[PDB]
Amino acid sequence: YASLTEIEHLVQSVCKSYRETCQLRLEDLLRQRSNIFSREEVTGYQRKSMWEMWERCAHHLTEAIQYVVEFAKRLSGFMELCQNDQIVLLKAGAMEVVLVRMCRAYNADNRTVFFEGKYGGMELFRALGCSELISSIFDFSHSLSALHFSEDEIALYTALVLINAHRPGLQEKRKVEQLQYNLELAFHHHLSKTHRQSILAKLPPKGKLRSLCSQHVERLQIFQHLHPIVVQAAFPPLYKELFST
């Protein structure tokens, strides 16, 4: 039973861990909104091979994931879980966290995302050959931006995305349950101060994030059958460990 002070300093350690591991500062993202891929540039991207577009994306996701691993490592409670359970939660949740973080890099006004140094719409990504998945991600980021998360809310919400007692394969399900609740308490406690609790009913449905991540792993299965050597020779080993079977 965490006391209000224990819950307050859990808030503290989560928001600090996120500050230190947020990859890009929000203001650097907002500043770049005016930098948008031009017609020729978007065509250039569309005309790339599938193998080259996937390989670029694999690198950029791996880089994002490295920051999430760090976020978890600094998360109060996470390192106190058993090794197996740490792996289980990261394997299931690293991508989910990244997708949540990425709404920061989504510009709802022109419907673009920050990618390779500029902003571009979902058609930039055609060469990947998973336009349904990509359009789903754009819709998801669109839906998250309407909640106007602060950075502290992202910290708290991503901690919860990661600390999810419902993942299969846990050796100590009960420990994770306890940390999750303390984090739910932490999130509620923070939302009460700011008088922000009305975002809770507008949060993405349970399952929606897991669904997006499932589609991604499936589209990588299609791609890997088409280019098994590229994945083996050029994909980051971490990406392969996380998303490859």
Binding site: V69, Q83, Q86, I87, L90, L238, E241
Partner: peptide
């Protein structure tokens, strides 16, 4: 594994 390495 890599996750294990990244974690320590």
């Amino acid at each position: 594994t890599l996750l294990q390495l990244l974690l320590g």
